[PDB]
Amino acid sequence: MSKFFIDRPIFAWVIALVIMLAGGLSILSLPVNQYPAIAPPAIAVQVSYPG
Amino acid sequence: IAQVQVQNKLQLATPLLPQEVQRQGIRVTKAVKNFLMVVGVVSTDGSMTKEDLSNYIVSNIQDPLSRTKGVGDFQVFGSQYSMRIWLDPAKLNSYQLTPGDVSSAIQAQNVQISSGQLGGLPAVKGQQLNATIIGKTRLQTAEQFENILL
Amino acid sequence: MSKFFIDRPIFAWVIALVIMLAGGLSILSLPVNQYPAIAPPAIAVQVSYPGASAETVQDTVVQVIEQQMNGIDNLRYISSESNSDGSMTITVTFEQGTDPDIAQVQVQNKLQLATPLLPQEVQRQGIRVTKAVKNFLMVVGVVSTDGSMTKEDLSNYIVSNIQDPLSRTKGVGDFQVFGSQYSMRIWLDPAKLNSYQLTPG
Amino acid sequence: ASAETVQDTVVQVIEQQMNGIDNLRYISSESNSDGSMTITVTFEQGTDPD
Amino acid sequence: AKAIRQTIANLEPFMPQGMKVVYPYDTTPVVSASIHEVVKTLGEAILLVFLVMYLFLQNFRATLIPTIAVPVVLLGTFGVLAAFGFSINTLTMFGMVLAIGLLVDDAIVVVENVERVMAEEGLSPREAARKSMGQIQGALVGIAMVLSAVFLPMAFFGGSTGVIYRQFSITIVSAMALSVIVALILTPALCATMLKPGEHKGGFFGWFNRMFLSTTHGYERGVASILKHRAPYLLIYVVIVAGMIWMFTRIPTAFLPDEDQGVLFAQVQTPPGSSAERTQVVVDSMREYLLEKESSSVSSVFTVTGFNFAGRGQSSGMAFIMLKPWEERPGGENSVFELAKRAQMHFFSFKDAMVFAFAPPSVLELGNATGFDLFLQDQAGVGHEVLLQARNKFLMLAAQNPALQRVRPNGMSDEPQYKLEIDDEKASALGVSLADINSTVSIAWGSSYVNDFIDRGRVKRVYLQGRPDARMNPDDLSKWYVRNDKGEMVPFNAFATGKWEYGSPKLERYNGVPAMEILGEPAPGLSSGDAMAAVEEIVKQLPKGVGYSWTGLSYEERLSGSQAPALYALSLLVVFLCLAALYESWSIPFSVMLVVPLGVIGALLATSMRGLSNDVFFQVGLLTTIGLSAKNAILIVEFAKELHEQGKGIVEAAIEACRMRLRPIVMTSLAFILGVVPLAISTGAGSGSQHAIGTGVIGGMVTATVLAIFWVPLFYVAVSTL
């Protein structure tokens, strides 16, 4: 699969930096947080009964 | 859809609950265990007290940041102001009164009644005057709850 | 391999018109409209508290409801409005691409705990929560030809016979009649209500 | 209650107010002799029942 | 609308006598007429391209190959946009009309290639088809990558603009990919079946082809003045690029052009504190004007009193005006905008009421009028009257501002309201309890609700209110008597006086704090950013304690920003990358990357002198213009460099490539001209959309093709040799 690309290096470079370009556009839109949704979903039904 | 299923089964739960639990209304909220950030105000000059700070938070900070993104459920360390009436049992004995009588009188004074409208439809032929009659309004300051007559 | 796909011309005819046939089925299975989902999903909470003022409707219903619109996910801005004849609306507007039925579930859940704090008349008028967009789609308007029926006759006919089968159809989310149904009005004459030592109570 | 008591105080109120629910096919209702009530709202196919 | 008409069809046999159901207001026939108009213009575009190819080439069985390759790619585009779940609207149909040329070019390329090899060797189709597939098989996936790189990265944006450009992007890229695979699998296997291996025809059409060859030879000896004058034209090129950069400031930017709808609204609002008689008089005179004076463009006037879109009351009205359909009002003087302008000057002649006549926007779902809106709110609790004074200051300073136009309160002003003051201690000292006073007031004026009652098979309600003759003026608030605690009767004159005060009838709130609205629209020439900035200068002169906040479409267009420079930068970068992919070198594809301003100059000039602003359709037209001009220039540069690397000089291979390529380039250019013409000059429903997306494309492509076909080999030689 490389024998196409030893004869043609520029197309290999342009595949490489198209991947770099899509990744650089992906860096500037991902949310940066500490941990993923590890916690289970919980529902807290609550009411103040009087006195 | 988990909240949907929880308050689907809660609807079947509510008829066997007491009348008062039904008249009050119970609420369903997605629970988050940790606290992200505590936002609090202090008093630098020592002038305004603790309940003043809780009043200012619930009146003017809780509302403008609970609509924004990310801020879900929360918990206020304190509560807002309230026109708190302190009855006095000696002076209730002095006048042959009852706390039920004070309660009925205060439910009679600050009513916001729908007091109608001048020239409201259907109008007699030849009417040219229109004005929204404001009747009594519910009272606002301490000197206006102070003059409720029993 | 190669010669199984190159040598057969009507194999290509079949692939091209299977693409055409799937296109024809997909034409007759798509909607037709004018522009895609541009506007964000709104939701309106409206009730008509009769004989009131602007301040009365506001400080008895509107503030009591919108002090409990806290802790709703994907909310952009809440904007309410209270008129003078006694009717009002809270127009909650969510973010674009949110799910409108879970949205209506959350808004109804957060106003069912402000509903018992309302006046009794505001509760007995019937609080409506609809998810529909701001424009008027179409006006269905009935007209008497001979002239033997007045405005409120035609309005009664709409509310009593057109409104109830039309509000349940596939697509209609919010309606508004220009008028009212019949309601057996009782007009208190205060001279005769004075004559017998009686009150409106 | 009677049949027409339940029909005039419960069934017809809930039918007048239940307008505009998603994927609604037909609603049917009946008022019984011993005071009960049954409205069987039938949604169309593929509706997720929650 | 179909289900509503079916429900009224199931409810119509049970009408009473003389009960007709009419439809005064309806915004569905504009949608039906718009989709019928765009599918009709698609039909005549296909018919005109077929007619041009059949009259100019005079051979039926080679024209049959692209005119059967167009419905395959069309129906495939339908199926692919149906796979993601997107609806047939004006937007995807504009995508199909703009993709007609980009799908017809490839079929023209492969048909002319087999015609050329048929004229060269005339041998067996197998190995020659292998060779011709070897040339064009790389070229079609190359132009697929090129046009994907130039058009697809507008899909990765958010907002209303993001949804519109992802509709256009996946429509054009879907028609592109279907055109590539359909051409590759079908058009050699369709041109290789039933043809003849035409030449030397008699009479007039063959002599016309000789005249076309003579104009080609005149091109061949007219390009000598280009090739000898190798120095001068680069300064003219820099002049054109500098004119483009100057021209991007001239044409104002918008969102989407204000279309015709057949719908006009009128907002009646008397001097408030008025009754229903004055509003009914103004409403009936408006109806008489619109029915006897302007019946040539107004069908039916459905006037509602009490429900304008500002608020509600007794002193408001609104006329839902339905204009006649577009076959009864031809000509630019009977549009909804000219009817609005000719009605507004007469509505100024109504000296009684303040009547404002406005037309709804293009997208009805966004709002209910045109232009911007903002909610002037407070934060500290400065006071309702101070906020009303600040709103009046905002309105007068914006009406004196030459960057705005017809700013509105969208609300009601302060009017008299009767505050009766119950003398509390005197009333309770005379004996009457205060709950009886409140019950008497609320039931006698506020129209109380007691219980229900059934009638004729339906439970309705019972109300309870005083007479229409005992609440009409402050002298008749003394007719009501309230019972004492011992059976006596106490009037309201004993314990209730009256003071007229001040207040607004429509109170507004926004994010839990009081507010007032301001509606309006920018100047007829200025952009939306200039109206934004002008509001940003008016708000700075407000008192301390209030604050602006934007609403609706204004919230998006003020908070999101503009990612169009990032759009053009990323799109041109990655299409340069796919050109260096197609050419395997770095300095060569600048001779196509440089061509872009010479493409977009025609779109800029054509939308300048026609008065068509910048919107989403103008940018889609620029992208398709850039794509088709680059798609012509790359075939020029690719086949020229291929004939250079086959063993010949630069300029000679360039000249034989461009002379062999002039007939398909000008042929598909004129075919795309004839495609995009019948929507750029059309008259009907959906006018301004078709005018913008036709005018930009026609101007840009008409200058781009027949100027790049002169100048692309020029700086091709200037960047390959030097």
From Swiss-Prot, chain E:
What are the inducing conditions? Answer: By growth under severe iron limitation.
Activity regulation as described? Export of antibiotics and solvents is dramatically decreased in the presence of the protonophore carbonyl cyanide m-chlorophenylhydrazone (CCCP), therefore may be driven by a proton gradient. Antibiotic efflux is inhibited by pyridopyrimidine derivatives, such as ABI-PP, acting by binding to a hydrophobic pocket in MexB.
UniProt topology in membrane = Multi-pass membrane protein
According to the lineage, what is the superkingdom? Bacteria
Cytoplasmic-side stretches of the chain, per the record, are 58-63, 112-139, 195-230, 584-589, 638-664
Gene Ontology molecular functions: efflux transmembrane transporter activity; xenobiotic transmembrane transporter activity
Q: Residue ranges, Periplasmic compartment? A: 84-89, 159-171, 250-563, 610-615, 684-696
The family annotation for this protein states: Belongs to the resistance-nodulation-cell division (RND) (TC 2.A.6) family.
Quaternary state and interactors: Component of the MexAB-OprM multidrug efflux complex, composed of six MexA subunits forming a hexameric tube, binding to a MexB trimer, which interact with the trimeric OprM outer membrane channel protein. OprM is thought to not directly contact MexB; instead, MexA joins MexB and OprM by forming a funnel-like hexamer anchored to the inner membrane. MexA may initially form a hexameric ring complex with MexB prior to OprM, then OprM undergoes a conformational change as it contacts MexA, allowing the periplasmic gate to open.
The miscellaneous annotation reads:
Pyridopyrimidine derivatives, such as ABI-PP, are not exported by the MexAB-OprM efflux pump, bind tightly to a MexB hydrophobic pocket and so potentiate the activities of antibiotics such as erythromycin.
- Role noted for this protein: The inner membrane transporter component of the MexAB-OprM efflux system that confers multidrug resistance. Functions as the major efflux pump for n-hexane and p-xylene efflux. Has been shown in one study to be involved in the active efflux of the autoinducer N-(3-oxododecanoyl) homoserine lactone, thereby playing an indirect role in quorum-sensing; but has been shown in another study not to be involved in efflux of this autoinducer. Over-expression of the pump increases antibiotic and solvent efflux capacities. Implicated in the secretion of the siderophore pyoverdine.
Q: What is this protein called?
A: Multidrug resistance protein MexB
Shown chain mapped onto the complete sequence: 303 to 1030 of 1046
